[PDB]
Curated annotation (Swiss-Prot), chain B:
Binding sites annotated in the UniProt record for K(+) 4: T108, T217
Name of the protein this chain belongs to: Potassium channel subfamily K member 2
Catalytic reactions on record: K(+)(in) = K(+)(out); L-glutamate(out) = L-glutamate(in); chloride(in) = chloride(out); Rb(+)(in) = Rb(+)(out)
Record text on subunit structure and interactions: Homodimer; disulfide-linked. Heterodimer with KCNK1; disulfide-linked. Heterodimer with KCNK4. Heterodimer with KCNK10. Heterodimer with KCNK18. Interacts with AKAP5; the channel is recruited to postsynaptic microdomains by AKAP5 where it can integrate neurotransmitter receptor signals. Part of a complex composed of AKAP5 and ADRB2. Upon AKAP5 binding, the channel is no longer sensitive to intracellular acidification, membrane stretch or arachidonic acid stimuli. Interacts with POPDC1; the interaction enhances KCNK2 surface expression and is inhibited by cAMP.
Record-marked site positions (pH sensor): H92
Residues of the full protein shown: 50 to 331 of 426
Residues bound to K(+) 3: G110, F111, G219, F220
Superkingdom of origin organism: Eukaryota
Binding site for K(+) 1: T108, I109, T217, I218
Tissue: Detected in hippocampus astrocytes (at protein level). Detected in dorsal root ganglia (DRG) neurons (at protein level). High expression in brain and lung. Also detected in kidney, heart and skeletal muscle. Not detected in liver. In the brain, highest expression in olfactory bulb, hippocampus and cerebellum.
Residues covered by region (Interaction with AKAP5): 264-277
Ion transport listed as a keyword: yes
Binding-site residues for K(+) 2, renumbered to this chain: I109, G110, I218, G219
GO molecular function: identical protein binding; ligand-gated channel activity; mechanosensitive potassium channel activity; metal ion binding; outward rectifier potassium channel activity; potassium ion leak channel activity; protein heterodimerization activity; voltage-gated potassium channel activity
Length: 268, 282
């Protein structure tokens, strides 16, 4: 009977409107500054090099505009890492197929590989899940007979998951990425989130911009991803549970308010 | 009992792990066979345009050309139009684009054609994702249940007119899943691809490629329905993410049906090797 999706639908729409207004408040200023200071860089180069004329720069730009479509790529290791992006639905896009066949293979490779990877992430999920269950069984005895109650220890135990988790799956890889690709502190944490949330903008990739890295690095990246995906999958599911709790709390909250509001009001 | 099953599970994981590794190696070799030819041709014919413009204009800084290209490469990472004319442009963070950017984030599509450059925009995106991604999941779940039981209406009337004599309900489940994919790929794949073909000017394969990459939430961003500037009625850009909302629910079922098919084929090829290695030509 009750739809109940309508209330969710409008929360998501409003959530997109808020984010939209926040992003164009955060980004359009530095969009202005970049684009205005590029015409300075161009008008600098029309003057500083009279060798190039007004039309001949435009010819060069459009060859780089055509170079956008392509840019060694697709080597023995890169195409291996490309396939990892597809089945995990990360899809950084820094490497994308250009052949008509490459597209069709990728379409078929995704429709069959994405379900395949799901079973691995599920097994790695169970594997990771019961390993942490061994760590908390030791912790759920030593200070659990002592004062604090088990209905409240559920709070202490979940803190240690996120604390110890963001160390291994977020902190350590970001520190490593900071000292290998030379990223900033935020770039590395931004990359970790964008990677393990499967958003994968591709603006930061541990394999692109490829001057220095060895064969001990590019395997550990995807291996980190495999296990890290399982971590956020739990995290992004715990956060969902928090939203389910808050949703029920605020559903009955309007319940009691609109209970007493119409209660006194109806009395004549 | 308690950890006897766990030994039986890491042996399951190890077998899956290697199937995925083999599957990645196969795809790898196929892609670098499909793509690296067209990489070689593009890489060699750009050094021709390189050396063409190295001689033809000697009085340009011969080595600072690369310095200019990289400044344009860095400018490519933003929404630029660096030309002599057309020095006014449109904003990629306008009222509508940032709305569509947020749709990419919570759906974990993330086309990346528009990405935040401010350190604040990054941190908001990080917080916007970790809270928005779970949020969207409930909408897609509700739209999933909503779509699911709407199709349950249409199949209920059809699964009665198809009740002739000697019909087997275990095999009518085969007929019913065909009409799901048939009508499914029409409304959620065929019709939007045909529309994208006539609006974005794409080819037939580009549009179907885009639909898959979008609704499989891979989202390379090499094709985006709202990346160029062509006309965009703005009855169009809302229907795009609205299509995505319901289309994601469709592949979510499809990519789950395919998973079940692989679970069946896994058991069949499990016992197929049992039959083979049990006998071995008697
Ligand atoms: C241009 C037409 C492309 C058709 C691709 C069909 C691929 C079917 C794959 C089925 C995977 C289960
Ligand atoms: C060294 C500076 C790193 C600061 C990273 C800030 C990220 C804020 C995340 C907010 C968590 C809810
Ligand atoms: C019935 C739907 C109401 C759910 C309201 C959820 C509000 C989430 C607040 C998150 C802000 C950080
Ligand atoms: C981003 C915070 C959104 C807050 C929306 C609150 C909506 C209240 C839901 C009431 C449901 C009965
Ligand atoms: C690409 C499918 C590999 C099949 C391996 C089967 C091993 C039992
Ligand atoms: K790019
Ligand atoms: K994804
Ligand atoms: K992506
Ligand atoms: K993605
Ligand atoms: K991308």
């Amino acid at each position: 009977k009750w739809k109940t999706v309508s209330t969710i639908f409008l929360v998501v729409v409003l959530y997109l409107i808020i984010g939209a207004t926040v992003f164009k408040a955060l980004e359009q200023p530095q969009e202005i500054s970049q684009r205005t200071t590029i015409v300075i860089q161009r008008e600098k180069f029309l003057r500083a090099h009279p060798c190039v004329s007004d039309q001949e720069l435009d010819e060069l730009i459009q060859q780089i505009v055509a170079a956008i479509n392509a840019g060694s790529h697709w080597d023995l290791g890169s195409s291996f890492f490309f396939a990892g992006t597809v089945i995990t639905t990360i899809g950084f896009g820094n490497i994308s197929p250009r052949t008509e066949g490459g597209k069709i293979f990728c379409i078929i490779y995704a429709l069959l590989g994405i379900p395949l990877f799901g079973f691995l992430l599920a097994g790695v999920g169970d594997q990771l899940g019961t390993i942490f269950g061994k760590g908390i069984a030791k912790v759920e005895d030593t200070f659990i007979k002592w004062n604090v109650s088990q209905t409240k220890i559920r709070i202490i135990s979940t803190i240690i998951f996120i604390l110890f988790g963001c160390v291994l799956f977020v902190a350590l890889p970001a520190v490593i990425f900071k000292h290998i690709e030379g990223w900033s502190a935020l770039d590395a944490i931004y990359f970790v989130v964008i990677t393990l949330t499967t958003i994968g903008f591709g603006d930061y990739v541990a394999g692109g911009s490829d001057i220095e890295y060895l064969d001990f690095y590019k395997p550990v990246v995807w291996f980190w991803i495999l296990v890290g995906l399982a971590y956020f999958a739990a995290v992004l599911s715990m956060i969902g549970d928090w939203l389910r709790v808050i949703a029920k709390k605020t559903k009955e909250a309007v319940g009691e308010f609109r209970a007493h509001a119409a209660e006194w009001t109806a009395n004549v």
